[PDB]
Amino acid sequence: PKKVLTGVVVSDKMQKTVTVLVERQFPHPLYGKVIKRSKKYLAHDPEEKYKLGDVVEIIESRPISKRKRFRVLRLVESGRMDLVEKYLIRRQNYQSLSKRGGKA
Amino acid sequence: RNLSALKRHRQSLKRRLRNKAKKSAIKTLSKKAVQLAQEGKAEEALKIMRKAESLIDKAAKGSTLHKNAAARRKSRLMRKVRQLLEAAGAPLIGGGLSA
Amino acid sequence: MVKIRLARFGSKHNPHYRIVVTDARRKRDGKYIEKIGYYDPRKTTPDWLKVDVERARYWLSVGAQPTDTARRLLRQAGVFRQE
Amino acid sequence: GRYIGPVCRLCRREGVKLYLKGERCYSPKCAMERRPYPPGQHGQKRARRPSDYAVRLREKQKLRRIYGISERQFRNLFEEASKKKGVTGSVFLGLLESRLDNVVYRLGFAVSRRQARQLVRHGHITVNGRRVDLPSYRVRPGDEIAVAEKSRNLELIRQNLEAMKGRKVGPWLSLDVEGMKGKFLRLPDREDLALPVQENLVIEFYSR
RNA sequence: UGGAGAGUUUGAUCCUGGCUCAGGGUGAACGCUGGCGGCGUGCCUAAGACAUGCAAGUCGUGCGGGCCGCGGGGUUUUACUCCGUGGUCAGCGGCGGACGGGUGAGUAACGCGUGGGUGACCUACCCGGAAGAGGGGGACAACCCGGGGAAACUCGGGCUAAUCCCCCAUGUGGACCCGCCCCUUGGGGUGUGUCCAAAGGGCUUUGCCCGCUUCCGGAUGGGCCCGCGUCCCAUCAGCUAGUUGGUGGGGUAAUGGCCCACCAAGGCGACGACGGGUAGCCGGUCUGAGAGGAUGGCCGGCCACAGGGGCACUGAGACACGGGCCCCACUCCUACGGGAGGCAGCAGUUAGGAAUCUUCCGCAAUGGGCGCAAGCCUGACGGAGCGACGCCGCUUGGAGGAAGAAGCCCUUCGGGGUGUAAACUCCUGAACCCGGGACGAAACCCCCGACGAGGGGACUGACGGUACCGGGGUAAUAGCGCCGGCCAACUCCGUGCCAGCAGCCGCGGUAAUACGGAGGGCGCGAGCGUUACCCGGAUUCACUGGGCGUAAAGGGCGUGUAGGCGGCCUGGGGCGUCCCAUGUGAAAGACCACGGCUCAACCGUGGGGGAGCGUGGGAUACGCUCAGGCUAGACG
């Protein structure tokens, strides 16, 4: 079965491509506590049909480009930057904890 | 010394010089056909295209191209010619092309 | 070319073969595709040759190609008897 | 190879009386009858309370020297007994008791276990027909253990199976003094055996 | 069915805590010692360098020749020449040389593992099905002739065969463009146009065998892609410009920045990017009560490599260990112009090292390549050799034999011990001798039969004259460590903080169970002990299973980002979680049973279990999520 995944479009800054942030939980192999963990897939969007904030499903596909191996299957729930927001802030903290520092 | 399957390298060289040639004809004629379709010269362009098709299918006859390779060639050729001719605003004057 | 042959499995001076289906290119004792019988050359026990002709008949039906000895045993097991 | 060397001294050290010989370890001789104390210079001085180790040590030594088997073999057997279903203690005794040499000793073909060993070694003993000469061979229930046709005329075997006329045999065995045959009926149980051994201690000795 | 702890901080105590020991393990090495057999195992260092032999070929049923020879013809003789046949040699052509064998350098990566995807693909030989092979043309070796080179080797001219190459036809069919239909990434169908087939050979010769062509299907093997998993250092924090995506094109069997041109300005990172270090990954293995830790050697699977670096050719498949080209290093030959090599194949040499074997036998068996077959090749393989290197099995004897020899040792001088030990008697009888002597081998092949099914016949073993069987037959190897506590085993003498011991505590400066010897003793035994390394004890990195007032350990305080965690009631979803069924979880190994070798080791057959992941179905208490409500937290 071609793998199907669900994540949030955290980037529509490309031509016919969207970055989908897929999240997944699971027990820690030794400590058992359930831990969240995520990943970004560059899904193909031929019709630039998906916008920043959409919760789409990604489908395993025949390679489209290096890095692109998934296609946007269908939209699950439109708009919701509450999720995108998280992502961006996590990003913002980066440029900080290097040579000088971040925020609070 | 001397492992007589030196014959193999002997043969390989001849086989090489053999494919080497067939592929050149192919390339050349293809260009020729393409170049003409470009010019808009209907008849002649197509005519040449047939030789091209022929040599290609023929190269695939032995082991100089075989199957897909040849199929890929033919498509890309008929592809370009069709387009170039249509663009040139030229009516396909017989020979080749299932128009 | 897939074949039906014998694979060494006994031990020094105590040979025991597994009638097997495998690609001709495999080691003789490497990964086979399917075991379809066994054979004890020295008949150390009453049951020194089992064959499961059902399966043999299948592999043969798909291009399996027995070794001259593998066939001898397959035959003995009635794999070819048509009657 | 097996021990060899003064035996009626192990008896002394082990305290208990081991029967590592025949006729004599019954005569008023087997040292335990004369000087029932360990060998060597200090054999008679007072003995200090033995350590838990010493206790477990000796117990094993005893049980083991009875069947005059090496530590290697003795240990392996133990590990097997340990791995099977059922009380290790009993099982272990059962396996030791299933050694061919022992069974031959049990049937009276031999005066002592050592003698039994040599009988088996010199092919004087047979198991279900085929002759076996492995003192370590494991007799299973059902096996008939006879004396070699060829050997049935050996003075010693005559003398022995003669004295056997009358003598009873373990409830897990059956002897046919007649044709010099014997049969292994079943694995003896701990209740069947009367060894001066505390198997619980031996099991513990290997716990450490 | 599974879990032991001890010594050592003190004058003593309790705690904390490190150190140390008893156990198991090994591709071992070293010391002393060493009798047999079976099975297994044996360069861990220089992926250093390698003499010599061997290690991949095979087809005369694809083709034409050269050389040596025999026979028969056309010849009155001669010259000249035709046919048949033996041997031999390459050459052309074909299939194999991409397997098998080796190694682990590199690689932290879709490399490997596990589960999936391929409407994005390939597959020689093999199997099933459908259809087909008509006509014509050419060339290059061999061979002949001439040239150049020291050699390796090469150049020119002439002739010639084929299942070598090409052209025309036939088009079952198939390929491409375009259209339409059904399907849904490039799947399947259909119409017009164009395009593409083939080779023959053998005969028990009008038939049968071997082969050839196009096409569909199968089978096997394989490419590519994806989820999850895969060591250390953050005293490595920012990395990236083919770099991220797009459009068109190239390239491939095929997707893809794989490559290119243009365009856009992106992509990755603390869930640790980038960088450094280390390392082939796995089934497994060792240890452990388990969880875990350590490991990847034999064997099996995958990857990578073939003196170092790069490259492509030929092919179904190679970027090709025993093929090619170039550059580099090193070695060898040279008339200095130029040539030749690559044992990480088998055996062997040499170097390094604490340390790792025979230049063995055989192709009989199993497996492989070529062949119609006979058969040929096979250092793959089956065996044998050497090494207690490991494991299992076995011997150096058995019974009797004194209130007790001798010697040695101790003594309270009475005696005690070594000791039934010996001597000695009887008994058996490993070695060794003699005789017999094998399974592993029945196929290919021949004959009958239809070259089928089936039936009959013939050839063939390195191991080996070995195993095993029978007769005869000799009492016939024992060593090593230890004895203060941990820890089983004590005395005398010598020595005098010396000489020495030592794993830890410690022992030795004249009464030492601790040093050396002796007597005695304990442990194990063809072994015993040491050194090294892994796990254990160590709940001493604590998930199971620890801690931080004074023992090591609370951040100098706050504000607060990410993140972790979240009160009560209802409803929806069903992601976590739980359940059932199903696929997968190779073999080997592990567990159990039965069985083969006299046992066992070792091995055969069968059975059982098995985490994780895929798919289908179900449950909804708790965690989650969405929607609604509450006021006990919080805030006002």
Ligand SMILES: [Mg+2]
């Ligand atoms: Mg050839």
Ligand SMILES: [Mg+2]
């Ligand atoms: Mg038990």
Ligand SMILES: [Mg+2]
């Ligand atoms: Mg003190």
Ligand SMILES: [Mg+2]
């Ligand atoms: Mg104390």
Ligand SMILES: [Mg+2]
């Ligand atoms: Mg302590």
Ligand SMILES: [Mg+2]
């Ligand atoms: Mg000739």
Ligand SMILES: [Mg+2]
């Ligand atoms: Mg080939």
Ligand SMILES: [Mg+2]
């Ligand atoms: Mg690295």
Ligand SMILES: [Mg+2]
């Ligand atoms: Mg990966």
Ligand SMILES: [Mg+2]
């Ligand atoms: Mg081929």
Ligand SMILES: [Mg+2]
């Ligand atoms: Mg010429």
Ligand SMILES: [Mg+2]
């Ligand atoms: Mg041809």
Ligand SMILES: [Mg+2]
């Ligand atoms: Mg048709």
Ligand SMILES: [Mg+2]
């Ligand atoms: Mg044609």
Ligand SMILES: [Mg+2]
């Ligand atoms: Mg790129």
Ligand SMILES: [Mg+2]
């Ligand atoms: Mg992440």
